[PDB]
Nucleic acid binder design. Sequence first.
RNA 1: UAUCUGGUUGAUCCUGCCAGUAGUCAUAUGCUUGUCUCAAAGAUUAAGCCAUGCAUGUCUAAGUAUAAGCAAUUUAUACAGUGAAACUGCGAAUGGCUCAUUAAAUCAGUUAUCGUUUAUUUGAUAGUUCCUUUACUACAUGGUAUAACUGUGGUAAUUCUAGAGCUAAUACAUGCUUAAAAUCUCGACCCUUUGGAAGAGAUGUAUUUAUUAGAUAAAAAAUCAAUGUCUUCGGACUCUUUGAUGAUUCAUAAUAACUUUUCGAAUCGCAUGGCCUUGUGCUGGCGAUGGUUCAUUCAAAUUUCUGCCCUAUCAACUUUCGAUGGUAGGAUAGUGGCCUACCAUGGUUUCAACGGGUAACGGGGAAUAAGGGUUCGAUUCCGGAGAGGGAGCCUGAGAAACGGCUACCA
RNA 2: GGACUUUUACUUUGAAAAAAUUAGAGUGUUCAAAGCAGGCGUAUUGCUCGAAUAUAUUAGCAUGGAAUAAUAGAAUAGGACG
RNA 3: GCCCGUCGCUAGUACCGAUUGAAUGGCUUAGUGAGGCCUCAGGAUCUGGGA
Lengths: 155, 167, 131, 188, 260
Amino acid sequence: STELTVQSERAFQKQPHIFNNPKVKTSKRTKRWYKNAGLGFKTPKTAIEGSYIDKKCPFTGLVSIRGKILTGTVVSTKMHRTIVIRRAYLHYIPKYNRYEKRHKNVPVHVSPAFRVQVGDIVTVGQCRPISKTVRFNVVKVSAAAAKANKQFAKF
Amino acid sequence: GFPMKQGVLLPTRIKLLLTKNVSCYRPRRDGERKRKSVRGAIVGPDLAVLALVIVKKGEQELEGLTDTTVPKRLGPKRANNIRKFFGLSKEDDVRDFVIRREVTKGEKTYTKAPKIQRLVTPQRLQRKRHQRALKVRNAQAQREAAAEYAQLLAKRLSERKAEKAEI
Amino acid sequence: PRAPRTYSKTYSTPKRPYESSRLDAELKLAGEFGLKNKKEIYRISFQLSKIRRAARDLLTRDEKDPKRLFEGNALIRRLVRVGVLSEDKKKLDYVLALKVEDFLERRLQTQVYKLGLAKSVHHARVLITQR
Amino acid sequence: GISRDSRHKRSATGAKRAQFRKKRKFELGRQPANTKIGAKRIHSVRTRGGNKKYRALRIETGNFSWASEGISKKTRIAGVVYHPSNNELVRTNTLTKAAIVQIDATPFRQWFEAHYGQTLGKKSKNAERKWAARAASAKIESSVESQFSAGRLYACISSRPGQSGRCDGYILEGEELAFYLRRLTAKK
Amino acid sequence: ARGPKKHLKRLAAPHHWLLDKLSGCYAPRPSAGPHKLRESLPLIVFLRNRLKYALNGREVKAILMQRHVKVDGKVRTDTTYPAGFMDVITLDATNENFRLVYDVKGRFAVHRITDEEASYKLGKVKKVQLGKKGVPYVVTHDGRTIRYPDPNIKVNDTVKIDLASGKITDFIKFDAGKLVYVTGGRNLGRIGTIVHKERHDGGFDLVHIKDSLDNTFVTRLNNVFVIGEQGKPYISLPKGKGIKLSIAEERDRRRAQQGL
RNA sequence: UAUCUGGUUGAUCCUGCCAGUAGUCAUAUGCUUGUCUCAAAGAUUAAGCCAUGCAUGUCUAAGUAUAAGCAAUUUAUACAGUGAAACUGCGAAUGGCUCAUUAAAUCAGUUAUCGUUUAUUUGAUAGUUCCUUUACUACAUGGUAUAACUGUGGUAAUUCUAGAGCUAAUACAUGCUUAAAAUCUCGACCCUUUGGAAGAGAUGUAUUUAUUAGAUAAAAAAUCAAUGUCUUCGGACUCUUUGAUGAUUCAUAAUAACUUUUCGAAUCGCAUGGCCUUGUGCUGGCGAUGGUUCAUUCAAAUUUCUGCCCUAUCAACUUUCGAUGGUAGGAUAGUGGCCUACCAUGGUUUCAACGGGUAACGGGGAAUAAGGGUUCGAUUCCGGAGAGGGAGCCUGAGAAACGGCUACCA
RNA sequence: GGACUUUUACUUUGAAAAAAUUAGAGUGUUCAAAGCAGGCGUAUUGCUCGAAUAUAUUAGCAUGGAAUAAUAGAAUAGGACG
RNA sequence: GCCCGUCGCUAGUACCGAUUGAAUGGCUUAGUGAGGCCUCAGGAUCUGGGA
Ligand SMILES: [Mg+2]
Ligand SMILES: [Mg+2]
Ligand SMILES: [Mg+2]
Ligand SMILES: [Mg+2]
Ligand SMILES: [Mg+2]
Ligand SMILES: [Mg+2]
Ligand SMILES: [Mg+2]
Ligand SMILES: [Mg+2]
Ligand SMILES: [Mg+2]
Ligand SMILES: [Mg+2]
Ligand SMILES: [Mg+2]
Ligand SMILES: [Mg+2]
Ligand SMILES: [Mg+2]
Ligand SMILES: [Mg+2]
Ligand SMILES: [Mg+2]
Ligand SMILES: [Mg+2]
Ligand SMILES: [Mg+2]
Ligand SMILES: [Mg+2]
Ligand SMILES: [Mg+2]
Ligand SMILES: [Mg+2]
Ligand SMILES: [Mg+2]
Ligand SMILES: [Mg+2]
Ligand SMILES: [Mg+2]
Ligand SMILES: [Mg+2]
Ligand SMILES: [Mg+2]
Ligand SMILES: [Mg+2]
Ligand SMILES: [Mg+2]
Ligand SMILES: [Mg+2]
Ligand SMILES: [Mg+2]
Ligand SMILES: [Mg+2]
Ligand SMILES: [Mg+2]
Ligand SMILES: [Mg+2]
Ligand SMILES: [Mg+2]
Ligand SMILES: [Mg+2]
Ligand SMILES: [Mg+2]
């Protein structure tokens, strides 16, 4: 989420230990650190191009992806910088030798390097407990908008 | 029978949490504390006994007090304590100033002295010598191992530069 | 806290309690092999019962399946070992046959009688239990 | 004691949970140092596994880095001036991580004027050499240099006094200094 | 539950020890040491249950306190000292040397080795880090730290270790086609070369293994212990040579040697 | 190891249940009871209550012996054998018991720590400690204060203890030391260059902060500021050094400082030997105990994915006084609304949330044999939880401990 | 090493996998329930086979299949390749 | 022939019901609040600012 302001806190937002020396006249104002999260997830350009802070960003932040790599589909984007995804799955019930639809909602952090919207399929990588409920971080959007522009006005 | 306890103030009894290292309590166990009654440090007619400690003798002699005298049980055991209980400098050599206690084995009187401690000895000096030695000997051996590696690393460079000149 | 001593029982009892044919059938056996119990027959029925079950199972597996080959062979050689399974009929479709009497015939009780040495199954009992 | 379990606390669904087990000491918490300014007072607390933490309560000096000059100096801590977490922390002058302080300037002044021979604000041989090498490097920065004239430099505590007994930080600079000067007056 | 657990219920003992069910209740608990609990062979077990030298546990302490047994060169006097795979056990009296190394059934075999081979060992390097003051060290599967290894030495290579000294005297890279001993899993005990490695970034590389009977199987990396070249092992293997036969093949062997 | 029979009618065929039949690591009770082996057993109700006894203590050649203890001989006038008491160290967090609580909790299988603590075992690991640095610091080794004990006492009464007099250390508390070298800052001077310099300080490890190195996605150029090494004095720089991971601000190192300054052996047992300038000189064997840091091993703590019985006569639930998320802090061993402050309005639900019930600890498993199933698991193994109920906490690597303490209730 | 990849179910084979219980091999506890022993000689100075295998399924992991059943695609061309 | 209900007897079960009835258990507002821990102080005594 983030959007705008960036310096919109009581505390000055900065990536830790990424010093920019005022004496040295640089042409980009703020030096920015990023990383390649691994498992072949391209660190998107919006992160390197970015100016947002977010210490829970998998590419510009102090977290790491390790453990489960799940996909699910976005079902709520009301929380600032974090989303909820629904993970469907059929649960096999032996005696009847058939299945029942089940689901689980899962809370995941979402870097302002991404622009997620309800409906997208999203791949998320497990990280350290990031909050009370969140153990996951949006790592790539295997979607876009789900054809939004293709319902416009009349001819 | 409850004891007085210095510094309570108060002239009665109270119950206190006591710890290690304190009057009127001996801990049975590590970190044990026990809540126990204690008598205050102010004297009243409720005391069975006072404890008094003569500070100045008087005009006349108290019977079994001033007129009898009782020798300390033990003598100095630690080296320098023997020194100070005789004032000797570190020249006199202690072994002859250590106290010796006579004791009869029927028709054999024996003589047992302490066991001086922190006595400077050959065996101690031998172990001081050794320790200082090991540090240095190790240290020297530790550059060698480093130097042998630095070589192994340097003459690896001259194999990845003679390889870079083969092709 | 010590490993369980394991156990299990060694007989099974007829579902139908009072079937007159099975009763005569059982008694005859008892009077032939010097048994004292319906249990000494109950026991063997149970032994047979599992042996057959094993064999039924093995039979459902493909011819020359490893388990079948290995575990069938074993069971056959175990049966031939004690003289219950004839040399000819040595391939488990006849262990699938196999009667109770084939088993009772091989008890020390009977063997002690079969070559004289007692001249009555009961003299054979008494001798054996008497060292 | 203070407990850091999650097992109090409702579930994400909003469910109430039963008590499962009693508090253990391995989920324990202790109370804040709320370390204040002046006259050293530090107590050690024995933490898990052997191990000491040092609980600064009262502190008057810290070790403070002038990052762009690549040096650090120990100064008196004048006082707290801005805090993003709780304004009470400022009013009471409580020292914590992230606190904005004023410090002393005079140790940093003495160094700078000895190292550049320039003096802020307003004759040896090798000394002359070294100074002449420098400059084109002594051009400070308006918003830092002006602070020296007051004898007081804004700085951000970067250590944890309740944890380590140290009250350390860095001089504010550039953008970060811009940010709090704004807050200071645009709240002054 | 409040602290380090100190007993071991017989039945919770590892199976490759071959302790009996009854006669007691507890098994020995491996002391802390060079080898993990569940992949170890406590001295008590070796001196009594394999070698049959002791009858009591009481006589194991008696044997040991005279410093008869020594492991990997050193004496060792702990009854339940954790001996393990590749370690070397020596009885000076009785002039006997042993190496601890696996069956084909996954057990630790009693394996007599010669006096010379009895003075070195192999170590899987488990990690290679840069240590304090810039000194690089390796760490082998039995928890030795060795300063200044060969720069070419990486994790998963095996390593030949003096014993008399601390030092390395040779190493073998983890390459396609190098003699391998399998230490864990079902295929514990099997031996054979290496066909190829499955990668799987982020968890459990797989190592495809073929033996000298053109028989193939797989294990997690973790379970693969390099020990030489196709042909050339760097230690002597137990009889069987880690080949594993079907229950049929093993039946036929055992009933082929039948006529007294 | 795929079987049924009796009972509705006058008789009949059905539906349908009652009854019969068989097993039960399934309990009780009754009658009866000779032999072998095997051997469960106060779970169910009352995690109700408990007289008495026992269930945790522990010493190697190798921390402390002046027992006014025993022993004598055997070299021992400091000690030296043996050894009560006591100090010191370690252990008492294991084991054993029970099943009250507990329903997304526990637990299982499967994960994670790039999210931490870790006594011990094992393997590595320490030349730096003082000081304006010639009249110099105990290192051939610095300080007392205590038990036991002696002796004077108190109370009906306990593993209660007071006043007085002694004396130990691997207890307590202090406190010296070692090679050479290189790199840094300063800099008395001298002389104008292109500039150089004697000599002065600093640099163990750990702590805290800030800063930098930690390259590598194939190749090349110009310029600014500082400024390295080699001149055939216009200039060149030629070879230029790099660890791991899927991934890091990783491992490791460098700069400026910081600290009521961590560690850097004032210890013990056996042997007594070399060496010459003959000082009781200087050296020196085997291994104990300790010690900082890293590794290892025994662990721990959290943790990902999925899986629980009945219930809608429980449909909406969650933020009171954190419910869901963001920033900062505080606290923790450490992540995290764990807690606080500011800010926002989120989070779960017919794919059953939330609530209620459970005569519910979970699992490995048990019973029943066509198959599919049904029912059970307090209970020999793994995990969890508890010690009459609650809470608090001391010691310690480890306890929110109960054969530990503190408080309240009973 | 780079640069990018519609998404699922199902099925296969395999890894990871506690013992005890269960199924089951070997062995004459005198038989048997058991146990994991034991068996050969120079029975005077020791030789030797063992202590298997199967099941272990939902979920997660890894591989092969591409039928059956879903998902996504280019129509205001904001399509595809260079 | 069968057969329905009121009414009467004996015995049993469960329902309703004044008693704003009673008991056990789990949570819990408000008020009072032990104790240890942490902290501002204190200073019997006892040392070289510290205990
Ligand atoms: Mg929001
Ligand atoms: Mg001494
Ligand atoms: Mg406080
Ligand atoms: Mg043990
Ligand atoms: Mg991993
Ligand atoms: Mg009738
Ligand atoms: Mg009739
Ligand atoms: Mg009629
Ligand atoms: Mg019935
Ligand atoms: Mg009970
Ligand atoms: Mg019971
Ligand atoms: Mg009752
Ligand atoms: Mg004596
Ligand atoms: Mg226990
Ligand atoms: Mg004192
Ligand atoms: Mg100490
Ligand atoms: Mg570069
Ligand atoms: Mg690199
Ligand atoms: Mg680092
Ligand atoms: Mg001599
Ligand atoms: Mg109801
Ligand atoms: Mg937050
Ligand atoms: Mg709201
Ligand atoms: Mg429902
Ligand atoms: Mg219950
Ligand atoms: Mg159950
Ligand atoms: Mg159970
Ligand atoms: Mg119960
Ligand atoms: Mg407990
Ligand atoms: Mg009770
Ligand atoms: Mg309560
Ligand atoms: Mg308790
Ligand atoms: Mg206990
Ligand atoms: Mg499978
Ligand atoms: Mg098995």
